[PDB]
């Protein structure tokens, strides 16, 4: 949050070149290969962390090594080892594996087969670390759009008082949204929510997109640790092939006939802006919205 120039009380006194972007004065960087080359796909092994080559005038210094998130996961695990360790307490072979014999004697023979597998797990006995599960942090939820649900021309429940103090201006929360996922201070394209399941085929976030917290989280979980690489790249890739292209079904910009009408001294061509808001800005924008979700 301190890195964001938007929260800097003082404005930029020099050129924007010394800044990285409108949301980050200094970029955090992206994962890099063991050779120091740019990492794009998780299938290739990327170990180190470095500064993006993109230079809008200067290359800003990075801040994080990319091991903070996984370092947090590690200390979390290390401080759970106690509880599950004292819950763990051989265990596969136990004394009460015999107790059914006396009851079977009391029962007779017309139920012998009911002990079948029991006998089996006895016959084996004569002839022959763990990590947590169900902790429920998946049930947790985060939503950024809740900063902007109230606002409107007139805004309503359940947090209308943000409006009331803000006099129905929500821009001060829109830079917050662009801080979470880069909309719209860095385009409305945005960055999707990075799923936390094991995805060997993950695309690292590149360009200024990596300078948002969502993209930073995305890029922060592939960086392998020397401890134990627990993810195996797919062996079925390029076997079940899927070439689905999201470009045939895309609405593109049109230049419209600028049909000028004159209100008695005022020249303006209403056909063109009807074209450029109705279609180029509403229909196209919503279409590319569903298109990005589909992508």
């Amino acid at each position: 949050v301190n890195n964001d120039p938007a929260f800097s009380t003082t404005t930029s006194t020099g050129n924007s070149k010394n800044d990285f972007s409108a949301i980050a004065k200094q970029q955090f960087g992206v994962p890099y290969k063991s050779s120091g080359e740019v990492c794009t796909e998780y299938q290739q092994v990327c170990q180190t962390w470095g500064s993006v080559p993109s230079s809008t005038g200067s290359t800003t210094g990075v801040l994080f090594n990319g091991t903070e998130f996984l370092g947090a996961i590690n200390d979390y695990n290390g401080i759970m080892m106690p509880t599950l360790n004292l819950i763990r307490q051989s265990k596969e072979f136990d004394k009460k594996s015999r107790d059914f014999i006396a009851e079977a004697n009391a029962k007779g023979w017309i139920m012998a087969g009911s002990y079948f597998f029991d006998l089996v797990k006895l016959n084996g006995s004569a002839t022959e670390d763990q990590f947590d599960t169900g902790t429920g942090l998946d049930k947790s939820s985060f939503d950024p759009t809740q900063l902007t649900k109230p606002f409107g021309k007139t805004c309503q429940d359940p947090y209308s008082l943000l409006c009331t103090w803000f006099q129905n201006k929500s821009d001060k929360l829109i830079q917050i949204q662009s801080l979470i996922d880069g909309v719209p201070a860095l385009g409305q394209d945005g960055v999707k929510q990075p799923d936390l399941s094991d995805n060997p085929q993950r695309q690292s976030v590149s360009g200024p997109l990596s300078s948002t917290v969502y993209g930073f989280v995305n890029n922060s979980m592939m960086v392998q640790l020397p401890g134990q690489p627990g993810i195996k790249p797919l062996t079925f890739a390029n076997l079940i092939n899927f070439k689905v292209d999201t470009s045939l079904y895309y609405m593109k910009h049109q230049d419209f006939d600028c049909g000028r009408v004159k209100i008695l001294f005022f020249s303006f061509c209403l056909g063109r802006m009807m074209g450029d808001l109705f279609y180029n800005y509403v229909f196209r924008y919503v279409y590319n919205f569903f298109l990005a979700i589909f992508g």
Binding site: T13, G14, N18, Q26, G61
Partner: peptide, 12 residues
């Protein structure tokens, strides 16, 4: 190592 260059921008 950033300290030098925000220092610079300041006295510029």
């Amino acid at each position: 190592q950033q300290e030098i260059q925000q220092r610079t921008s300041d006295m510029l």
